[PDB]
Structure 1
C-alpha cells in the first residue's frame, strides 16, 4: 500500500478489507419477520430528503433508499467503477470491475468480476468514505474519496441528490503505465414507482460542456415522457477533464445482455467508442459509461473527479400524497435537471471537501478523545440521510414559508419522528441543523389540539381506542405507507394517547431546543408555549392518587412499549419533574407569572413525593407498584439527564444521582457481559438481569449513549466512555456483531438484534453537549 500516503484518510475512519467475510454477524431476535440486509453495507450517498444510495464496502450500489421511506437491498450490477491498466512494453492490458462479487445470472457475464480479497481497503468517516486498490496485478495503485456535501448549518448543498468520486492514481513502479477508470450506470428510471413497462421509453444522452478550463462530459439517463410522477426524472454520471487525461464515453449499452457491447472496448485499450445514441429502449435495460484514460510515468500522481446525480423530484407516499423534494428549490421541479446538479458538484467539490473538513476538524483535532469515539460519533450520522428522510418543497399541484421534515424511527417500524425516540435521537439536528429541529417541533406543536375520534384496534390487546385525543402529543407524524405530516399516530401497538412520557418529553425537547441554540429564540418559545402548558395540564389529570405525579397504569404506557410500569415510575416521574422545571423557566422568560407559580407548586409537591416513594438509599426504584418494582433501570433518571443539558440544576439530590449512576454502571453495565455490550435496561438487585419482559433484557443503543453522556456530565468520565465503548464495539469492531451503517434499537446478551437502521443511537451526539 503506497497510495494511502497520497490521500488523507483520518485515523478514526472505520475500516474493513474489500471482499472481507465477517463471521460473527447478528440477526433479528424476534419471532416476526424483520429486515436483515447482511453486513455488506457502507456509508450512504445523497443529501437530506434526496433519497440515498448505500454503496457497500465491496463496491456495489446495493442499499436503495431512493423511494422515500422504503429500504430496498439489491445490487444493481451495472453500476460500477472499473479499471484498465497496461504496462508500456506489454502486448495486453488487464481490465477489472472494482466489485468483490459477481452477478447472480448471466447479465454482464463478459465483464471481469470478483475483485480479489486482500487487495484493498474500505474506509468511512461519514459523510466521507474511501476505497484503496492495492493489487499485485495493478501496477498503478488507485484510491477514491466519495461523499455528498452534508454540512452543518447548511440547508442547501446538504439537500442535494449528488455524490462526488475523487480518484487518485499513483505509479510506484519504474515503467510507464496506461490507466483507464470507467464509471458505468444503469438507466434506473422505472426501478421503482412504475406499475408497468418498467424500462419503456428510457433513453440516454451525452452532454459535453466545454468552456475555458472546464470540460465536463456526462451521460443523462432519462425517459421520453415529460410526465410529472414519482418514477420519472433523470440520473447522470460524468467526469471533469484535468490535465493529462482524455475522456471517452458510450451512451448506450444493454444491461439485460452480456455487457460485451461495452466491455470489448474497455478491455482492449481502456477507451470507449464515443458512440452517441438516443434511441429509447422498450423492454431491455440500458446504461451509460464514462471513462478517462491517461499515462502515468514512474512516480507520477493524478487526481480526477467523477460525479453522480439523481433528479427524481417527486416523492409519493402510500396514502396518495405527492410532494416535491427539498433540492427542487435549488434546481427546479420538472425532473430534467440532473446535468445541472452534476455540474455544480464537479465544479465545487473541492470547496465542499474543505467545508466538511472544517466541521469535522474541532472533534478530530481534540487529542483527549479516543479515535473509536470519533468513529462512532461521525458514522452514526449516516442515519440522518439514510433514515427515509422526507423534506418537502410543496405538495404536487399546491407556496408556504416552511419546508416540513421527517426522519423515520426505522424501516421495520415505519413511523416519522416518533417523539419518544427523537427525545434521544434528535441531538444531531438541534446541534448541527437547528432550523430543521425547530421546524419539526413546530410540527408537533400544531398537532397538540388535533382530535380524531375515529377508532383503531390496539395491537397489544385488541381493544378499540380513539386515534388522537385533544391535548395529548402524538406518538408520530405518520408513516411513508400512509400520509406523513397529514395523518399522525400511525403507530398502533399501544394507545399513545394515554402514554405518560410523550407530553413531558415534548416539553423537554422544546426547552432543549431553546437552550442549545443560545437561549435567544423567544419567538420559538412563544410559538410553542400554549402547547407546552396544554401538554403538562393534560398529564396532571393522570395523577390518580393525588401525589402530584401522573400514574403509570400497569401497562406499557411509555417508550418501553412492552415493559409495564405501575404507580410512580422513576422514568416517567423524573421526566415529569424536569418538564415542570422547564415550563417554569419558559414562564419566566415569557413573563407568564401564573404559569410559573402553578408549575412551581406542582414541581415542589411532585419532587418531594418522587424522592419519598422511590429513593431506596442506593438508587431510585423502577416504580412503586410493579412486581419487580426494585429493579435497577438504566434510564431511571432520564429527567435529570435532560435537566443537566437544559441547565435546570438539581431536580434530585446530587449525592443520590451519583449513587444511582454508579449503581447502574456497577450492575446494568458491568454485570452484563462484563461491560462489553452497553447497559442492559433492567437488572435485579441480586445482579441478575430482570426477566419480566424482553425489553428489560435488551440493551438499547440510544439509551446507552444517552446514559454515557449523563455520566460524562456528572464527572464519571471513565464510566461514561466504558459504557459507550460496548455500543461502539458491538457496532463497528471485529469482535462485534456487524451492525455498521445499520445500528439497531436493541440487542440481547447473545448479540442478536431488534430493528436495524434505528434513530435512537443518534443520541451519541448528546456526548458533545
Structure 2
C-alpha cells in the first residue's frame, strides 16, 4: 500500500477490507417483520432533503433513499467505477470493475466482476469516505475520496443532490503505465414512482462545457417527458479535465443486456467510442459512461474529479401531497438541472473539502479524545442525511420557512418523533440550529390542534381521539401518509396521555435557546404559549395531588411497552426540569405570574419526588409497579437536561452522583462486563429486569446520553467506558456489524431492534 501516503485519511476513519466477510453479524431480536439489510453498507452520499444513496464498502450503489421516506436495498449493478491498466511493453492491458461482487443474473456478464479480496480498503469519516485499490495485477495504485458537502451552519450546499469522487492515481513501479478510470451509471428515471412502462422515454445526452481552463464532459440521463411528477427528472455523471488526461464517453449502453457494447471498448485500451445517441428507449434499460485515460510515468501522481448529481425535484408522500425538495431553491424546480448541479460540484469541490476539514478539525485535533470516540461522533451523523429526511421548498401547485423532518427510523416511519428527538436532535441544535428551531416551531403550532376522529390503539385495541388540544403530538406524520399535515401517525399507544411528551417539548425549547447563545428571545416568544399550555395540561394528570403527573400503569412514555405507575423517576425528573425551564423562560420574557406558578409547582414536586423515590443509593423506577425498585439507566433524564440547560441542581448533587455510580456499577458493569452499553433495567440483586423486552435492552441513544450526563458530572472514565460499548457493538470487528445503521436497541446476545434509528444521534450531547 503506497497510495495512502498520497491522500489524507484521518486515523479515526472507520475501516474495513473491500470484500471482507463479517462473521458475527446481528439480526432482529423480534418475531415480527423488521428491516435487515445486512452489514454491506457505507456512508451515504447526498444532502439533506435531497434523497440519499448508500454506496457500500464493497463499491456498490445499494441503499436507495431517493424516494423520500423509503429504504430500498438493491444493488444497481450498472453503477460502478471501473479501471483499465496496461504496462508499456505488454500486448494486453487488464480491466476490472471496482465491485467485490457480481450480478445475480446475466446482465452485464461481459464486465469483469468480483474485485478480489485483500486488495483494498474502505474508510469512512462522514461526510467523507474513501476506497484504496492496492492490487497485485494493477501496478498503478488508486484511491478515491467521495463526499457530499454536508457543512454545519450552511443550509445551501448541505441540501444538494450531489456527490464528488476525487481520484488519486500513483505509479510506484519503474515502468510507464496507461491508466483509465470509468464511471458508469444507469438512467434510473422510473426506478421509483412510475406505475407503468418504467424505462419508456428514457434518453441520454452528452454535454461538453469547454471554457478557458475548465473542460467538463457530462452525461445527462433523463426522459423525453416534461411532466412534473415525482418520478421525473435527471441524473448526471461527469468529469473535469485536468492536465495530462483525455476524456472519452459513451452516451448509451444497454443495462438490460450483456454490457459488451461498452466493455469491448474499455477492456481493449480504456478508451470509449465517444458515440452520442439521444434515441429514447422503450423497454430496455440504458446507461451512460464517462472515462479518463492517462499515462503515468514512474513516481508520478495525478488527481482527477468526477461527480454525480440527481435532479428529482418532487417528493410525493403516500397521502398524495407533493412538495418541492429544498435544493430546488438554488437550481430550479423543472427537473432539467442536473448538469448545473454537477458543474457547481466539479468547479467548487476543493472549497467544499476545505469547509468540511474546517468543521471536523476542532474535534480531530483534540488529542485528549480517543480516536474511537471521533469515529462514532462523525459517523453517527450519517443518519441526518439517511433518515428519510424531508425539507420542503413549497407544495406543488401552491411562504418564508421550509418545513423539515427526520424520521425516527424506517420500521416505524414517523417524522420527528418527539420522545426520541429529545435525544436525537443534538446535532441539529449544535450544527444546523435554524433547522432545529423550525422543527420546534412546527411542534409549537400543533399544541392546540384537536382532531376528534378516533383510531384503534394497537396495544389494547381500544378507540381513542387522534389529537387532544394542549397535548404535544408524538410525531408529525408518516411518509406513507401526510408529513406535517396529519400528525400522530403513531398508534401503538395513545400519545395524548403520555407523561413525557409535554415536558420533553418544554425542555427542547429551552435547550434550543440556551445552546444557541441565550439570545433568541423571539424563539422563546413564539413558543411561550405552547410551553405554558403543555405544562398546564400535564399538571391535570396528577391524580393524588403530590404535584407530579401520575403514570397510569400502562406504557405512557417513550419506553412504549414498559409500564410505569405512580411517580416515576423518568417522567418525574423530566417534569421537575421542565418546570425549572419554564420558570427561567418566564423570567426572560417578564411573565411574573408564570414564574411564580411554576416556581411553586416545582418546589412542591421536588420535595415529593425526593421523598417518594430516593432510597439511599439511587432513585426508584417508580412508586407503584411490581418491580418499582429496579435501577433504571435513564432514571435522572431530567437532571441530565438540566445540566445541559444550566438550570442547576434539581436533585441533590450527592444523590445524583450516587445514582450515576450505581447505574455504572450495575446497568453497565454487570451487563456483559460493561462491553455493550447500559441495560435499561436492572434489579438491585444485579440481575437484568425481565419484566419487559425494553428493560432487558440497551438503547443506544439512552446510553450515549447517559455517557454525556456522566461526563458533565466528572465521571470521565465511566462516561467513556459506557459509550465505548456502543461504539464497539456498532463499529468494531468484535461487534455486531451495525455501521451506518445504528439501531435503537440490542439484547445481551447482541441482536437488535430497529436499525437506522434517530436516537443514537444523542452522542453529540457529549460535545456540549
TM-score between the two structures when normalised by the length of structure 2:
1.00
CA distance in 1, matches of 2:570, 2:370: 31
Task: Please give the per-residue CA displacement for 1:390-439, whole angstroms capped at 9, x wherever unaligned.
Answer: 000000000x0000000000000000000000000000000000000000
1:287 shift after superposition:
0.0
1:611 shift after superposition:
0.1
CA distance in 2, matches of 1:177, 1:135: 15
Whether 2:166 is the aligned partner of 1:166: answer yes
CA distance in 1, matches of 2:293, 2:554: 67
CA distance in 1, matches of 2:388, 2:297: 46
Query: Which position in structure 1 is the counterpart of 2:519?
Result: 520
CA distance in 2, matches of 1:709, 1:30: 29
Query: Which position in structure 2 is the counterpart of 1:562?
Result: 561
Task: Please give the per-residue CA displacement for 1:492-546, whole angstroms capped at 9, x wherever unaligned.
Answer: 0000000000000000000000000000000000000000000000000000000
CA distance in 2, matches of 1:19, 1:567: 54
CA distance in 2, matches of 1:711, 1:296: 54
TM-score between the two structures when normalised by the length of structure 1:
1.00
Task: Please give the per-residue CA displacement for 1:451-488, whole angstroms capped at 9, x wherever unaligned.
Answer: 00000000000000000000000000000000000000
Task: Please give the per-residue CA displacement for 1:65-102, whole angstroms capped at 9, x wherever unaligned.
Answer: 00000000000000000000000000000000000000
Query: Which position in structure 2 is the counterpart of 1:204?
Result: 204
CA distance in 2, matches of 1:549, 1:619: 19
1:41 shift after superposition:
0.0
Query: Which position in structure 1 is the counterpart of 2:68?
Result: 68
Query: Which position in structure 2 is the counterpart of 1:409?
Result: 408
Task: Please give the per-residue CA displacement for 1:263-317, whole angstroms capped at 9, x wherever unaligned.
Answer: 0000000000000000000000000000000000000000000000000000000
CA distance in 1, matches of 2:289, 2:313: 24
CA distance in 2, matches of 1:5, 1:289: 30
Task: Please give the per-residue CA displacement for 1:553-607, whole angstroms capped at 9, x wherever unaligned.
Answer: 0000000000000000000000000000000000000000000000000000000
1:745 shift after superposition:
0.1
1:10 shift after superposition:
0.1
Q: How many residues align?
A: 768
Query: Which position in structure 2 is the counterpart of 1:184?
Result: 184
Task: Please give the per-residue CA displacement for 1:656-681, whole angstroms capped at 9, x wherever unaligned.
Answer: 00000000000000000000000000
CA distance in 2, matches of 1:374, 1:582: 31
Query: Which position in structure 2 is the counterpart of 1:673?
Result: 672
Name the SS for the 2:5 alignment partner.
Answer: helix
Task: Please give the per-residue CA displacement for 1:106-131, whole angstroms capped at 9, x wherever unaligned.
Answer: 00000000000000000000000000
CA distance in 2, matches of 1:617, 1:530: 39
Query: Which position in structure 2 is the counterpart of 1:118?
Result: 118
CA distance in 2, matches of 1:520, 1:358: 25
Task: Please give the per-residue CA displacement for 1:719-763, whole angstroms capped at 9, x wherever unaligned.
Answer: 000000000000000000000000000000000000000000000
CA distance in 1, matches of 2:596, 2:131: 60
CA distance in 2, matches of 1:151, 1:102: 35
CA distance in 2, matches of 1:717, 1:44: 32
CA distance in 1, matches of 2:559, 2:17: 38
1:651 shift after superposition:
0.1
CA distance in 2, matches of 1:29, 1:365: 39
Spell out the pairing of 1:202-601 with structure 2 (5 A cutoff): 202-398=202-398, 400-601=399-600
Name the SS for the 1:691 alignment partner.
Answer: coil
CA distance in 2, matches of 1:446, 1:306: 44
Name the SS for the 1:697 alignment partner.
Answer: coil
CA distance in 1, matches of 2:522, 2:30: 45
1:31 shift after superposition:
1.1
CA distance in 1, matches of 2:186, 2:242: 25
Name the SS for the 1:694 alignment partner.
Answer: coil
Name the SS for the 1:530 alignment partner.
Answer: helix
1:643 shift after superposition:
0.1
Name the SS for the 2:694 alignment partner.
Answer: helix
CA distance in 1, matches of 2:442, 2:185: 39
1:206 shift after superposition:
0.1
CA distance in 1, matches of 2:447, 2:608: 29
CA distance in 2, matches of 1:715, 1:13: 28
Unaligned runs of 5+ in 1: none
1:549 shift after superposition:
0.0
